[PDB]
Design a protein around this ligand. Structure first.
Ligand code: A1IQN
Ligand code: A1IQN
Lengths: 10, 238, 238, 10
């Protein structure tokens, strides 16, 4: 879940 | 008088905002172009998506945010992103035009442009009144940046786990803001309370925008115009 | 000689393609602009997304497709969309330029442009060789349209349920194509077999493209540049 | 699932 958010949060 | 740690907070917060807000707006030419059917939904979807990335970048440089759990980081960003977008957009808003002006007339947004992206005056009228009253506050960059960080680090948001830690972070930031206004803002006796009121206004705008976002995202012919990042952030997943 | 029902099929299939392929390409100016990092991924994501909508519109007008279950309609479109996009793109491909030319030089795509959207020569070299050999076939519009409908209505695709019905539809369409070539295509003694070979080539290009799409979609910093429709159609959900 | 596809397929 929240694939992009996790990525952007590093 | 302000302490050295209080001013380091201000410093790193101002630097974080300068790193994530580009006053040239030259990136806007790679959004899907504006059209003036929901003619403006593609362009405004790209504007909001771009803006979310910048808010995430700003959050990551708030002292202490990066140390939150990933779930608390996500929880804060999912509830607050739309509010920080409304706050940060004050930097392009013009009292003379009653619009957001981002460099060129291609990227000047009227209330009417936002209606061609699916929103109603139930949202846009409170939003424009919010921008004007915020713009009339004449905030220093320090204060504008602190208000965004305070807004982001609010613990009364659905989904937060470490309520105590993020409330302690927000307390620190509020103490900074109160001291800054007292020491550095001439005639700002009432400014801190006004800014806290604006945080309340943002909650109300958040709720209306979320209502109107649900109506969009339930129509696939419109939701398909959104970006993956917007779908993730404004979506209802936990 | 061709029968009246065979020619009604040709008619409605040609009309379906004219309704869904716009030779002016004037819609391309509302894609995110091309940049020549994956500089071309936003623009090509929008091109492919737009193209998927047109393939869906074409499918809905294939005789019998609309009568399939929604699940079989979805199953056929998820496996075949990328193939129909490769077939339909032959209409913009230029043997002289070795590129796809869509009106303006802004919308002229080299092999090199497609590499700046994440793909490798393992895909692009077979793809360009496919375009040229297809272009050299010099297909009539009738034949090009029939090949797309045949490709779409193939039953050996993962997920299909009513194998018998869609194979009967594809049989009808193949019989039409064979008769059309014999009656109406001078010197096309070998054309039907060549076109069937191209269908095999498309399977191989589909598999390579799907391999390379998995590598993109596993990197969220790239997949976030895709559209919701592309994520749905090229995605792995059932 | 396939929210947009279903919609576009009418
Ligand atoms: C976004 C920013 C800017 C302007 C903000 C604007 C004007 C356009 C409409 C927006 C975006 C509102 C609507 C209601 C929010 C939405 C949506 Si929708 C169509 C994707 C569901 C909220 C803030 C509004 C420009 C610059 O100052 C950077 C800043 O970040
Ligand atoms: C699409 C069409 C056109 C051109 C097709 C092209 C040129 C650009 C790159 C494409 C799209 C390929 C790549 C490999 C496919 C992909 C992808 Si992506 C970066 C979103 C994972 C497949 C077909 C290629 C124009 C017009 O003839 C309409 C037609 O429909």
């Amino acid at each position: 879940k929240h694939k992009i958010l996790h990525r952007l949060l590093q | 008088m302000l302490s050295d740690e209080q001013m380091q907070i201000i410093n790193s917060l101002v630097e974080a905002h300068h790193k994530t807000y580009d006053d040239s707006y030259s990136d806007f030419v790679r959004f899907r172009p504006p059209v003036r059917r929901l003619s403006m939904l593609p362009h405004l979807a790209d504007l909001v998506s771009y803006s979310i990335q910048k808010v995430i970048g700003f959050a990551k440089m708030i002292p202490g945010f990066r140390d939150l759990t990933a779930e608390d980081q996500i929880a804060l960003l999912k509830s607050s992103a739309i509010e920080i977008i409304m706050l940060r957009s004050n930097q392009s808003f013009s009292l003379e035009d009653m619009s957001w002006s981002c460099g060129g007339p291609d990227f000047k947004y009227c209330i009417n442009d936002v209606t061609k992206a699916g929103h109603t005056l139930e949202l846009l009228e409170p939003l424009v009144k919010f921008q004007v009253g915020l713009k009339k506050l004449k905030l220093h960059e320090e204060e504008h940046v602190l208000l965004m960080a305070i807004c982001l680090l609010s613990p009364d948001r659905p989904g937060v786990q470490d309520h105590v830690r993020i409330e302690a972070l927000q307390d620190r930031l509020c103490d900074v803001l109160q001291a800054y206004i007292r020491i550095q803002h001439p005639g700002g006796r009432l400014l801190y309370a006004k800014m806290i009121q604006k945080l309340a206004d943002l909650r109300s705008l958040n709720e209306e925008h979320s209502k109107q976002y649900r109506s969009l995202s339930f129509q696939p012919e419109h939701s398909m115009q959104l970006t993956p990042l917007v779908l993730e952030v404004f979506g209802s997943e936990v």
